[model samples]
Target chain A: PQADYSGEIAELYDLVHQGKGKDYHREAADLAALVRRHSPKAASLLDVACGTGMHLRHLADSFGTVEGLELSADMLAIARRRNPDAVLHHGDMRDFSLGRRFSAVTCMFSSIGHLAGQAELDAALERFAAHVLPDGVVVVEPWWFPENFTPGYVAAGTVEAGGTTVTRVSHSSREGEATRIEVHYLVAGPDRGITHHEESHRITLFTREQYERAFTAAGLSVEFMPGGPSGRGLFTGLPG
Target chain B: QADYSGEIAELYDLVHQGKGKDYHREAADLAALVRRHSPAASLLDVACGTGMHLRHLADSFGTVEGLELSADMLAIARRRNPDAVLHHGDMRDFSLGRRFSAVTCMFSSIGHLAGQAELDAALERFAAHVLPDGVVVVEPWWFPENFTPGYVAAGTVEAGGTTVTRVSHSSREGEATRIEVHYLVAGPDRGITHHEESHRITLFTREQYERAFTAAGLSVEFMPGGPSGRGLFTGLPGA
Candidate 1:
């Protein structure tokens, strides 16, 4: 299953998740800017599938309290080590209820892709809507629209951190209605041999119409915004 | 009267001073607006010369037709768009015996209608062609508020090894302005006056424009020009 890949992939996420390159970080900052602009008064936030919790730290400074939900206990362990004071819950995004609501809810990095079908996606969105307080906003960065994704697309780049160099190659393919992405990484350290890692994941490419239908079924209002942290485009839906 | 058809269409890249970055953006905006507002919109583009806008609208929306008075202009349009379902009809009194979702008269082509009666007839025809809630956008004759009485502008550009020089002069008379353009073509042959044409465009006061739009049974809104006094007048039939 796709969830199993998260265990080893989490270790290589930062090393090989390069597509838009340096602009990717700037785009993430822009997403934070939009969150601040749209909900300046938000106090509490729930970040579903928060992964390594990079965005959680930035979101924490903006909101009074921040909580994260992740399915991968290994990834949550990494997040726990990074932010020891923050609350981290290990749960599947498709069918989890926190029994509480937050002032804002966010699921970034196409984490909504974990739901394999329309019914599951709708359920996850309904759960997200259920946990968002009135006047609160829910920002879900879903998979790129199928119309925007093309198969056999490849991008490669190199990033240097300290004295070590990390070269990354990413390949994407469209199979049926889902996009499968594979990232291969080559990291060189003080040792002689090169360390290699490969991470692959599947994301459902929901059309604009399907997305709207799912949101409507969840009783949530949706709006599409261009550009996202990965410099890959995304849509943000606000629960009304 | 500037033959905006032939090579003039090619020279459009030069005449507009290379500010043609969003040639497709406006078309996209118009398409989105029509799709959102008028789902079953039947569009008619007046002065559909060369048919760039018409082709764009047709490509964006599946159900759109064109009307042009010039057979030569329509010829070029048809050459580019052989499958285009266009009608040979004058802008002033074109009647396809049907209404539309929107009507557009772009590229200052309204100037060719000449006088008040012709312009009114064209507007009436536009109104007659619009269905309920239909929108009509008139990139009208230049307004006096922004028109300079006398101005001269010129430029020279090389395309496909041929050098084309274009010079334009403008003068005002009462409510109408006359513009004269001279094009010098230089290639393997010596520099020659390829062609010269003059246009007399009427200027409308804000009140006159409102009266005409109201008389045509259309609600109107005035938008600020797009950077260079290229303003827009939007009208909707029957409120």
Candidate 2:
């Protein structure tokens, strides 16, 4: 399994992931450009699952206004710290009504993979569809498909901030139709010598047709663009 | 200045960690080599940074000691293996008044020497601390013929409550290779801090290494493949 950001893991999220050979500014620019292509005058955006507000920090300048919706209070706190001007909300992607719409609604960083099954994926897409303007755009960055998901994969990283050292190692395996990841963390600081904690996550490996079908069922015409920030690609949808 | 200590030392283990470098296997291979000369040979690892190899060697030999120059590095080494007898001393000028069955210096640390004189003195020092029949194992830095200058490498790693981003540039500097490294550390409570270091490690030739071993009265043999990819040199004291 993976992180829910319910613990101190949420606090160290930015420090651990800010430099994974990734450029937030570059991704933000690309996201904005794609949104503008679908809704040329897109001026406002709602960033779903905006953990740590990295993209929102850059996406804010590209749009007239930007807001963030995150499921974890721990992550929302840091997002609030980074995006003081943006309205940040705590809500699940499966079922949330902001009672407002933006020119663009985005669920980025392969968060769509967190959906448990087709029903959850359909529900989240419907929520995204409901939150987008009539002629606006909905963008979803997807996880790897079942065929592309590599089982028995392992990754490790280390980072230090303030006076703390954080080491994280993860191993992924196949869990039926989903990919399960078990992550272990070792944290050491001056106050506390060393401590260990871990989390498990099972993310559904939805196929390309499943996503396109969900977008259609949500009353949106979707097109899959190959090669995205996460290499799993992006789904850009417009009102049917 | 290029010697990592203090803040840099704190971030050292994680920054260059958990990669293709397999310390345990390297230690096992080394232990086998030394044991061939004298079974159950006690080991003394020179310039043992953070005691990565020493820890594994200790497990293999049970009787192992470490010598390191950086106090900060030595502190972590002691913390890592509290039972170890680690000495805080330079590799070139330390006398333990005792000889081990095997003396080793790995990870190309010997390249940090300034010139031929320093390399010879350090080799002599290592030779001086071994039993007459004991062996000295040194993992040398890449020689000039095999080295590729102007190579740059950078990466970032995260551990428990900290993150560190490191970048380095390596280029030829006359008779040696000059490497410059920069580190940016972000800790949960300490905020953000930056550090940089520069090192000019000599590019001693194959002949230079053999000459130094001979001057130290040790018969030398070079092995093609070693833990660090620069190969290893094993020497035994002459009669």
Candidate 3:
């Protein structure tokens, strides 16, 4: 059955990544640096899949007007709570159209993986191209290629906060060209008892050629570059 | 037995004020250690509360699992990892019918067992649940050697229209430490309610802990506790 990542999934999206561990602020700083390098004079920004709006809040500093397009209403609620002033549109990333354009569009944290196939990927890119102004820059953190993945890998660790304990585990597997990653989390406290949640995703093996082809089909020219602000790989594109 | 878990869970923040910062820092440090020591090891956190560490672990590991005992606490943790696989079970006896590369009991939760038998049982549980070459880390009770006798602690803080006063007193009695925590929560309408809980934790010698681990067929290491520079017991299998 197809996973319904709406509703509760959206609410948990930010919780899944909260805390100081992700170096989210640092990642946001790195992204701002990427934006500065690519679109130095950009006036407005649109952050797609802006879970909880942490990066959007940071991006708002450089751009006078910043808005977000999100799929989860729960995540949008959190984003709204954090940045009450920013305009947020709740819709699916694959076919969202906000009827407005921005000087820069950013879809970070591999949110691009949500689109499962080439057609969905192409459609998302087209929507992004449609909402981005002429000559604007669209930045994306592409999914990890299959060549970069290894199966049966495990990562585990623990954290303590205010008498509460958090344990995290990650398991990865490779089936054909797609990589499926499963994450398990445990939280416990003396009074709070215990609660658990698990999430997994299948990330397609989209190669550089496929990425380039998709961008070209979207009427955009892709410029693959390194050393973006967020320190992840950066893909910048301009509408043709 | 309700124990103090229910009461303590609510006053947790007050009982261990300023510990969140330390927990976050230690969580990051532990994540770094796992990445350095066993980069490919998957982690499962037993008695993971509020997922402060879970969030950090997610940054480096391929999969993370949290087992907790409280739904209210898990609410906050769920906020951190909504998709996290969480199990509701007591740490002393619960099993997920699986093993993990690493398991951790932090914030001196092991002390909650309250007796030598329970402590030993919990340690055995950890040994049973961890995989070969896996590490079991337990943040044990405050070292009696480092404990200062007759220490009286008091703190007061005001937030969100409520004033909270926390008073603590500790005393040592052969091989055990008795601590009492009293909370004076004063607010509008709710008024003042005095909540008090007492805990008795057995203090084990390093030799005793080593013997217990050896009995469980696990190797043991003693690391210095965080910030307080106390003692922590780590057991490993085939490592």
Candidate 4:
């Protein structure tokens, strides 16, 4: 199972998942409020892995300036078109510097899990920590607790509108210290018969302690909810 | 046959493999309903997917027979219960020479019939296969009025080092019940992949169900909480 986010997938990703599981706009506004609560001078925000600028646009509603860093040119292209008011960067989370710092830097929707393990996980957290003002906020949505994972579990969904249909199926298991996901996609459009896409998303099953440990190692006080916001578990910390 | 592919059948069973939801339970409750009306009656199961219900009830009944439309589903059913008499037949039109004391089409399988004529034909088929005075238990999908525009469901299952998470949304399409389910699978080697597919079932009104039973020459009564509390329509043929 994999998510390359190319072709139809990259073009229709927003339409497929809009207002489905998590409310990106509302969540962005809420996170901005949480950031300002911790750092009163948190007038600017940085969104890592900001795809199509969905959350970045909402963050702009609250903050003075909103910025995003994305690795996919295809996705960045769409993000730029949607939010022309904000600045966008093309880079990876593991090592990227904006040459400036914001009051709040957030890695939403478990994007931090894209890193392999603690080494890179800690690196990204430290990077986020380094780019924020003292006492600024660094929030990350972590994946399921390793203990909560169940092997051979499955999730499936299909969406159809007009004459097009899309179906997604996936099988889950563990790979060493990470949760391995095998996702299969079948897309049938009015013009393009039916095609399939597959990708494997491997995110280290970083436990609560590991995440908190990384937050501490990066010089932040960490608080967690094993069953946080939308079940990915939320890790909120204050950087100094 | 195309609707419930091997993959989707497996996923459906896995998602519904919840507590108190074993095939044994469906069989037990159905068998009891059979005996209540016709004591020690032979049983027939319509849309018997994987023979889960019939296999468990076979030993108790004199002769247990099953009928299904999907070959992919029937293959699994035949494998699970090698000795049971299973037929690959559609609910709308299928005739076996012998009649049973009771017949059942549970799990809201009747909703798959796309229109009212098919519903009436399926009821007639059920009526034809059962002996007079015998009961025919059916679990129908929600009536048009009861259907919610935006219904969502989520389930999780894990074993060994693998985990599966499933979520779905239900919406109405004209008069059909359309559902879009999303899947997430994680394992030791594959990492993570997401997939989704759309399934549409027919929508029938409560009056339509009653009319179908009556037109089939079967009198029907409603049960508030049928097998799974979704409600059921138990029909009786003229003695």
* Candidate 1: tens digits of C-alpha lDDT, residues A70-108: 988778888888778898898987878777898777888
Stronger candidate by lDDT (2 vs 3): 2
Q: What interface RMSD, in Å and to 1 decimal, does model 2 have?
A: 15.1
Give me the candidate number with maximum lDDT. 2
TM-score of each model, in listed order:
0.47, 0.55, 0.51, 0.59
Q: What is candidate 1's CA lDDT for residue B236?
A: 83
lDDT per residue as tens, model 4, A48-115: 98977888888888889889988888888999999987789998898998789888888877777778
Sort by TM-score, best first: what order? 4, 2, 3, 1
Q: What shift in Å separates residue A144 of candidate 1 from its native position after superposition? A: 1.7
| Model 4 lDDT at residue A96 | 92
User: Per-model TM-score of chain A alone?
Assistant: 0.87, 0.94, 0.88, 0.91
- Residue B160 lDDT in model 4? 56
lDDT per residue as tens, model 3, B36-148 = 44554578887787777787787667778888877767766787799778777787787778887778777666656666677677778888888786777777777667666
Q: Tell me the tens digit of each residue's lDDT in model 3 across A18-51.
A: 5425656777677667666766777888999887
lDDT at B95, model 4:
84
Best by TM-score: 4
Q: Write the per-residue lDDT of candidate 4 for residues B1-239, one digit (tens) a residue.
A: 23676566665565567323777776787788888888775889999987788878988888888998878888888888888889988999888998898889988898889888999999999999889868888998887877876665555565555556566667778888787766666555555655567777777888888899999999988886776666888889982
DockQ comparison, 1 vs 4, better candidate: 4
